[PDB]
């Protein structure tokens, strides 16, 4: 910005001034910004319906999360997807679980994500995502891990 | 270990710009000490305020004196240190007369007499290279 000298009141500019800069913090854009959360009554249909043709799958390990319930919360917050059927509450310390995510991505296209959770002592998940575009799938998959 | 003692100092990137007890403002690149500029009096580095386009120094006074950092010299020499002699040459059109000869001598010390020959304004330095 351009600075013109001022006597503090609320504002008043000097006849001449100098260029000055002020440094700011970084802005972080999250997948959460791109997606608006929703749940589905039946994930499986929606999940197929959006586009299994943009389907990509990647496996992640969440080692800093020792249970399913926290795991579902991390993918849900990051992506900006509300887990379907109230799947943030998962049977505590169950060996397998299927996590249903839904939300709509920018442009107005739905993004669904399925994370099949395995619980050892840490959480591993194979996250399969489907979307009406290549971009949401890639985006979610990358952000989670 | 650097030749000129650091009375006070500041980090601009990974390059250390410091004052010396010689009143020399030097910068440490590569483990080599180069003099960015000469201080006439004893000065301390308040900090580098990007706004003013300056490094703010203060004497004995709780007032401001300013030295803009000679970035073109510093970048030429830094690039030389990295062993990016060509890169330092891109900087050369904006290194003046005697400074091209000096920066050339930097290039040379690090190595590559020839690239130093193209940048050195002075014919004698070319002739020796």
Curated annotation (Swiss-Prot), chain A:
The coatomer is a cytosolic protein complex that binds to dilysine motifs and reversibly associates with Golgi non-clathrin-coated vesicles, which further mediate biosynthetic protein transport from the ER, via the Golgi up to the trans Golgi network. Coatomer complex is required for budding from Golgi membranes, and is essential for the retrograde Golgi-to-ER transport of dilysine-tagged proteins. This is Coatomer subunit gamma-1. It comes from the Eukaryota. Oligomeric complex that consists of at least the alpha, beta, beta', gamma, delta, epsilon and zeta subunits. Interacts with ZNF289/ARFGAP2 through its C-terminal appendage domain. Interacts with EGFR upon EGF treatment; interaction is essential for regulation of EGF-dependent nuclear transport of EGFR by retrograde trafficking from the Golgi to the ER. The coatomer interacts with KDEL receptors; the interaction is important for retrograde trafficking of KDEL-bearing proteins from the Golgi to the endoplasmic reticulum. Interacts with COPB1. Interacts with TMED10 (via C-terminus). It comes from Mus musculus. Belongs to the COPG family. The chain holds residues 730 to 874 of 874 of the full protein. It is found in: Cytoplasm, Cytosol; Golgi apparatus membrane; Cytoplasmic vesicle, COPI-coated vesicle membrane.
Curated annotation (Swiss-Prot), chain B:
Belongs to the WD repeat COPB2 family. Oligomeric complex that consists of at least the alpha, beta, beta', gamma, delta, epsilon and zeta subunits. Probably interacts with PEX11A. Interacts with SCYL1. Interacts with JAGN1. The coatomer is a cytosolic protein complex that binds to dilysine motifs and reversibly associates with Golgi non-clathrin-coated vesicles, which further mediate biosynthetic protein transport from the ER, via the Golgi up to the trans Golgi network. Coatomer complex is required for budding from Golgi membranes, and is essential for the retrograde Golgi-to-ER transport of dilysine-tagged proteins. The chain holds residues 519 to 647 of 905 of the full protein. The modification N6-acetyllysine is found at residue 109. Disruption phenotype: The knockout of the gene results in early embryonic lethality with no viable embryos recovered at 12.5 dpc. The gene is Copb2. It is found in: Cytoplasm, Cytosol; Golgi apparatus membrane; Cytoplasmic vesicle, COPI-coated vesicle membrane. This is Coatomer subunit beta'. It comes from Mus musculus (Mouse).
């Amino acid at each position: 910005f351009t600075v013109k000298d001022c006597d503090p009141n609320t504002g008043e500019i000097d006849e001449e001034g100098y260029e000055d800069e002020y440094v700011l913090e970084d802005l972080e854009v999250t997948v959460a910004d791109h997606i608006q959360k929703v749940m589905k009554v039946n994930f499986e249909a929606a999940w197929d319906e959006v586009g299994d043709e943009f389907e990509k799958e990647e496996t992640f390990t969440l080692s800093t999360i020792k249970t399913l319930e926290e795991a579902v919360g991390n993918i849900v917050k990051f992506l900006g997807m509300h887990p379907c059927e109230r799947s943030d509450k998962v049977p505590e310390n169950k060996n397998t679980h299927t996590l249903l995510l839904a939300g709509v991505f920018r442009g107005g296209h739905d993004i669904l994500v399925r994370s099949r959770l395995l619980l050892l002592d840490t959480v591993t998940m194979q996250v399969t995502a489907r979307s009406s575009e290549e971009l949401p799938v890639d985006i979610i998959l990358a952000s989670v891990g | 270990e650097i030749q000129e003692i650091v009375k006070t100092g500041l980090w601009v990137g990974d390059c250390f710009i410091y004052t010396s007890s010689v009143n020399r403002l030097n910068y440490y690149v590569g483990g080599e000490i180069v003099t960015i500029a000469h201080l006439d009096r004893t000065m301390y580095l308040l900090g580098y305020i990007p706004k003013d386009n300056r490094l703010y120094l203060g004497d004995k006074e709780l007032n401001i004196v300013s030295y803009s950092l000679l970035v073109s010299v510093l970048e030429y020499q830094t690039a030389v240190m990295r062993r990016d002699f060509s890169m330092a040459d891109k900087v050369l059109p904006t290194i003046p007369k005697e400074q091209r000869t000096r920066v050339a001598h930097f290039l040379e010390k690090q190595g590559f007499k020839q690239q130093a020959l193209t940048v050195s304004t002075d014919p004698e330095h070319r002739f020796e290279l």
